[PDB]
């Protein structure tokens, strides 16, 4: 019934930022396409960002005691961040890593994650309809 | 209006074949699955399966003449073979990687794929949901 | 009761091929030998060998259905393909590996298997009786 | 007096194929090239193409058996299969490994071949007259 | 004629220790079944172990001088003695390397051996028959 | 029209060095082959050989100034140069890399090149008529 | 006489959080275990906790200003953070990193850390216990 | 007309710490020294540091906005951030790298820096003075 | 009420060698200290050291055999033998991995242990006084 | 009061040579530009360049012998070089490392420098500017 | 005026074993050679051999003791052993490893020693002249 | 008879050149000290030093041409250049490598040498002295 999406480090820049790369929607935008396909899907989309770690993990934390759905993009983090990873792998509702870009046809480095591992699936390289498709899944 | 999905060795032994990694829906109901989802969504989808590379080599030059898009679980031809990917380079319209499975949460050497960077995107560990998803994704 | 035994890429060349390797033994005086054995041991074995990955798959389907055992020498295969790796870990009989030369006297790559972690166990450097020691561990 | 040309996968599809990677010559053209050029040189050469790696396995060893020397394109596999590595390994007459495109100038994988240590040589971005150059080689 | 069996650092240990990784039978029952086969096989068995890199030493090199074969399955030397290793390249009888664990489906570090290169041959992974089948190699 | 050809260090030991390896034909020879080779084909041959990087070096920034294709043997330095690959780089006619030997067939290092990516393409293991063949590509 | 305990992210999670990998014990209790012993010893330990990378850093810098030892438990950060490593560099006081858990018994990522070289020691694996065994080394 | 000078984690402590490595200048003298050079220079500096990874990024996406020229030292997440990466990535005035410490003369993980791709360029081990070079750099 | 305490090669050296390293601490002195600490706990220790892989095996098994804990500190075996790692794993009572020297401080091939991960845990860079907090541990 | 200025490999080549990477000015404008900075800063610059690594090595011993500073752009041999490190590190007098282009941006084997580390420090990607920085740097 | 030479494992077989690459001269012989060398040297010679690690150690640490010099040729153990490099970086007089082959001519893993670091020098591939060879140094 | 002594770059400035790595002997002294040593051993010793690839690669041929006996010390250009290996390996007499200073206590590229293997044997970490030691050993 509800799911939160997370959204860190940079994804607030998102409209403006390298639009080749990433597109022209900013991240209202963004919150306000996942609002609206939540309605159709009668779920309650949570949609938040932040470019700090903490308030990602406390977020990630309150979803772990409420057993709520997380849906996930971190970000640069992603690729650093095992502190992320802990907290995640608090979560017992599923988690879906999502993408933006296809991290596979870039720098090296943005081919490993540290949240796959311990996420239930993950969505690259559909733009921001990957939000939208992680919010179809977890309403069946 | 017109997709196809492509699958590589050992996705005709889906159903039978270790369910807790893959589940329990065999290849037919996922066809079945995929055409039906399909028609609600106005595409035509044709759905193939092979357990020979030259087949489903095949398959994609077909898609690339015809430019048209391609939903693609290789099974483990996609951490092993370059000539598949060189096919699929050849591909104009959307390629759509699918993994039933989350192949991060496993053996290290199912973490490297030759078609993700010449993917469109890459839907994984969402099961077969994973194949559908991607339709709607194309549907857009 | 009965065995199949496998045989990949290259081993009906087996004979004339370089024999300080693997030996002046034909593929065909390696099924009679392996016929004989299993009489002596009161199994059945069914032995076949293809240059195709698929035809290979097909083979340890059927045994994977059937439950019966396998004694499986891949060739080249053995080092490259994952699915093959896929459908022999669908086998709920014993799978020995087999090779005929000594792997680890020979170029490095050769010292990796796929098959081997999924293997009940593995044979290598005692030639075609290799095939024939497997039998009589299934035997017990 | 009798060379094989051997064309692996994706080799058919030379012609509409990314042309900026690989040239406007089809293979059908190819063939007429280097049947020309045989003619010239006093040699008959037969060229094969498939996509199928059990297939080119069969006309390397019918070379083998016939102690035929042999231009050796085999695409993708080049990079993968050790299979085909053996197979050419039971050669005795020359064996000259061919790429049309500079590998050494794309992605790291193609830097690598299982083929070159077993080859006489190797001639790699030539385009098409890599394998006209090649011929010349045999003719002395 | 006579075979030396020769094991190394823990396998007297053998019984009672993890038996889900190694089994039920002791290492007197493992010497008494190989005696035994020995005498069906009409050689003679001198079975020897050691926790002692050195003793182990002596009994090879006592093997080198009277080129007598060995069976060797060294424990966890096998992933770390050169000096080992230095000590059987100076057989000239044949020697069989062994393992009850297939190494190959546990840790990283023990999918390689030192001995393996310079064995003539290696049977992992089918428990204390392994020794068995060795045995009977040798015998032909 | 012209073409010059390169050749580094130890080249002028061609001959007498090690003719297991590179041959019975010595540098003066292979000057008057290429020499002859290029009047055949309409050409003008400029062969020159130094052990001196610097001299290298030089004969390459003519050859940029004067936009003239190179053929290039530049020995081990093509294993070592950055530089040399630097002043390479700067070449707007085609440069074709020449090795006599076949390297992949010898120790691991000579597997690589500074060189070959920024080639036009390579020829190796086809002895000294590499050169003839790099040649010949050059006058069509 | 003052000690400060420093735990990074995830540590007030501690409780409730995978008790099979870290326990039952909350971080309160924690800290009323320590603060405890601290009596028992004879010193003052002030621990803070914080999911806050800057905030850890003020703190760690205000120990170095005193030059009070540090207990510190860093968390996921202990894999990751260089700029934690360069803070406690700047101690003169003993520091002691703890982690609750054998790291070393998990992911291979976690077998590293930025602290260690700078750490004066290092506890692991011995629980909440580790926290009071730091203490009482540094009471002498 | 205007530069950001942006100091990461650790570089309020400068002065103090280690001073071997770093200098005795602490960060109110360097904001000092850099707006004084700056005046001379015709340009307004701002200079700011901070601990805290999302306050930096937030100065980042501030210069982005204004399109003013960085001179970012980093402190530790040079060698760790992606986020920052991708945050300077959007910069489209020039981005200049600086390190107090020639980190090249280092600890090994020090060597490789997130940022210097992306850098317009980078000067290390120049002292405090860099930064002062870098302004005058700005002012052309 | 028993633990053993088990000391490595070049432990009895302990005292005279390398004392900025180890300490100025005797093995005797060591053994008082325990064997005193152990008074005041409750417990008995049983300190053994030797240089010999053998006879430090044998004492592990004995205390395997016992259902009793082990301190260990192994020296230069800890980074090298898998044949101690391999009887250590027999241990049902905990054992507790002791390293006098802060080992992550020191060259980088002592940062790796074979032990560490069937340890329950590890203490290293504490001095002498690990060991007595190991024993502390068991205490509880 | 006087600095040497030291440029390797392709330096001389600098103007005509790749301008998107290196620029439109040549070497003779960058003496030019070197010695009139150097005329306002009260210094003597003696600028040289060759392509000859025995060359540079002389010029850097006498400035060694001279204790002389030096400015060293060394080309292709950054790279490869040990023996240009090791005259180097005989300098009394500071070294600044300088590259026109920003070599962290490029092939990745250019991401590492020999001379880095004995360097006092080093400028990168501020063009021939980078020398006159490097200069200033020196004149306090 | 005394030295000890110290043999590791399989020194003693030295004479029969593989005389391609150590030699036809044994054990006693090479006693005898040095004794006499020490005697024309004024030095006198204790050699000693041992296949026991622990033995070896015992008489490093001897030596130790006695601040005398040590000529060590540890065999396979210069390749694996922190134990017996632990021991040795106890000597305050001089160090000579010996290798009787050119282990660098040789399998991979022979090119790296854990004493080479801690030794006073090195002498490799001079037979069994390089322990001569090793006196007389000391003797100066 | 006749040994070639041969020295490569910055050997000339041996003697003032860090000298607690490599000693106050001057270059001329070295030549005098070898000059006298192969006069007591019957022989003539030739000594030769250029800081260029091209004259020691000539000096190598000279006494390839010979058959005369080389001592080689390369400086830099042993872990650096293959064009010297390769010259090097025509040597029909003796190749004896040389360093003074053992580079196997020094940085870690030092370690690898291309020159060893082609060797007949290497002295390291000797002084001087190793050059005398090298001369006896060929008068044997
Ligand atoms: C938001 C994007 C990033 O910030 C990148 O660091 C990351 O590599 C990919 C990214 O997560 C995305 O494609 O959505
Ligand atoms: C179909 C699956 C496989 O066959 C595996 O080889 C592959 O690693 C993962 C897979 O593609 C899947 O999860 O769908
Ligand atoms: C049959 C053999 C091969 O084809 C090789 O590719 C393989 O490395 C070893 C082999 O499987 C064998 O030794 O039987
Ligand atoms: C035919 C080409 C391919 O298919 C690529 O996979 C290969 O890397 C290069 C290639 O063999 C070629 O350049 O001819
Ligand atoms: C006896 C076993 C061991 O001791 C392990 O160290 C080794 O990795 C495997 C082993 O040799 C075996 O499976 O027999
Ligand atoms: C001339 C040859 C050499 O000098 C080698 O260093 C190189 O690896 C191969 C070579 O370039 C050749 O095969 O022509
Ligand atoms: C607190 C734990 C973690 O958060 C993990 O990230 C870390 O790998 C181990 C840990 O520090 C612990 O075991 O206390
Ligand atoms: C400020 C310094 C650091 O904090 C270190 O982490 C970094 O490696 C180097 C540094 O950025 C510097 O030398 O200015
Ligand atoms: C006793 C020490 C050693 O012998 C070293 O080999 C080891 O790396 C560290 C050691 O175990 C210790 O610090 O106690
Ligand atoms: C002069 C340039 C080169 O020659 C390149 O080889 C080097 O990687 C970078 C360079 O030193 C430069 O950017 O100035
Ligand atoms: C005695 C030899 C050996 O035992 C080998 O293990 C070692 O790699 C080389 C050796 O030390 C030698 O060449 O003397
Ligand atoms: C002469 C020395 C050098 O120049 C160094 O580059 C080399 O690493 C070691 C050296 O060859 C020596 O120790 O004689």
Avoid at 22 to 30: Q, V
Avoid at 33 to 46: H, Q, S
Avoid at 89 to 95: K, M, N, V, Y
Avoid at 108 to 124: D, K, M, N
Wanted: glycine share 8%; aromatic share 4%; proline share 4%.
């Amino acid at each position: 019934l509800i799911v939160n999406v997370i959204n860190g480090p940079n994804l607030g820049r998102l409209g403006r930022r390298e639009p080749a790369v990433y597109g022209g929607t900013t991240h209202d935008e963004l919150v306000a396409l996942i609002e609206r396909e939540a309605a159709e899907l009668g779920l309650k989309a949570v949609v938040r960002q932040s470019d700090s770690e903490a308030q990602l993990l406390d977020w990630i934390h309150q979803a772990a005691d409420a057993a709520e759905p997380v849906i996930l993009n971190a970000g640069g983090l992603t690729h650093t961040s095992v502190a992320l990873r802990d907290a995640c792998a608090e979560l017992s509702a599923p988690l879906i890593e999502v993408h933006i870009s296809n991290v596979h046809a870039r720098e090296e480095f943005r081919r490993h994650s540290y949240l796959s591992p311990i996420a239930t699936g993950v969505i690259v390289g559909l733009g921001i309809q990957g939000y939208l498709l992680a919010l179809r899944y977890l309403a069946e």
